[PDB]
Specification:
monomer; 287 residues; alpha+beta; Phosphorylase Kinase, domain 1; Transferase(Phosphotransferase), domain 1; two-stranded antiparallel ribbon; 9 helices; 34% helix; 16% strand; globular; Hepatocyte growth factor receptor; transferase
């Protein structure tokens, strides 16, 4: 029931965020066309003046400090511009602290559900291509000193051109611990680095080549027995070698995302789209 007067915001911040703000005359939220809802708020189809967007409606913010943190995150995220990173089209902050986050619409949804869908017919080349795109997006994010912390196929989106966008970060968080994607040292210390993102990226590559099986179909104990994820049936040997490098027990010895983009670009280039990938019978329906 808390009232908030947004004129209490620091004028310098309000001026600084103006380039991120979308006016009400520029946005139609299609309220009867819901993409998804839950504790995070709600996601609707939108039109931005026309361009098809997803509009996340957040829970009301009634503290000026929290509003200011939201606006600041908007300014920062606006400049995280890269072809393989989900962009922020803009924000709105209506009366009584009712926020909207406006994102590009992703025709093909998240990458995990996309590859799992039996009516889709990916090749090895396609799946490696998706992984390469994710590596490019992560190379960018790492260059901004940004650590994702939940890199996974479910947190990447796919647009109408089959371009992968690394998502679930910044103001695009909460649109729907991840121990099975975490590096050993993160399991042990709760600390995340770009090198622990590289570990997660190896698991994401495994998700791609299995067409979205759950990893390890108790994890610290299991890993410390001397174990890794098994080579997927359709995973090329050089790509499995890259996965093992991503899971190096020494964080400093893992490849950088720059090295990953280089290595995977080379592997990708050798394929011509001849090899169709199918699910492993022992992984189908496993949660």
């Amino acid at each position: 029931t808390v009232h908030i007067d947004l004129s209490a915001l620091n004028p310098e911040l309000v001026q600084a965020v103006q380039h991120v703000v979308i006016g009400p005359s520029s946005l139609i939220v299609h309220f009867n066309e819901v993409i998804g809802r839950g504790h995070f708020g709600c996601v609707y189809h939108g039109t931005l003046l026309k361009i098809h967007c997803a509009v996340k409606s957040l829970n009301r913010i009634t503290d000026i400090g929290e509003v200011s943190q939201f606006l600041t995150e908007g300014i920062i995220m606006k400049d995280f511009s890269h072809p393989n990173v989900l962009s922020l089209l803009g924000i709105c902050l209506r009366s009584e602290g009712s926020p909207l986050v406006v994102l590009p619409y992703m025709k093909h949804g998240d990458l995990r559900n996309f590859i799992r869908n039996e009516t889709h017919n990916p090749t090895v080349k396609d799946l490696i291509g998706f992984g390469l795109q994710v590596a490019k997006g992560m190379k960018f994010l790492a260059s901004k000193k940004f650590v994702h912390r939940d890199l996974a196929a479910r947190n990447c989106m796919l647009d109408e051109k089959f371009t992968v966008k690394v998502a679930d970060f910044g103001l695009a968080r909460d649109m729907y611990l991840p121990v099975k994607w975490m590096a050993l040292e993160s399991l042990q210390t709760q600390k995340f680095t770009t090198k622990s993102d590289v570990w997660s990226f190896g698991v994401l590559l495994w998700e791609l080549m299995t067409r979205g099986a759950p990893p390890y179909p108790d994890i610290t104990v299991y890993l410390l027995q001397g174990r890794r994820l098994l080579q997927p049936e359709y995973c090329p040997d050089p790509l499995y070698e890259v996965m093992l490098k991503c899971w190096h027990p020494k964080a400093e010895m893992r490849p950088s995302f720059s090295e990953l983009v280089s290595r995977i670009s080379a592997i990708f280039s050798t394929f011509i789209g001849e090899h169709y990938v199918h699910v492993n019978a022992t992984y189908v329906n496993v949660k």
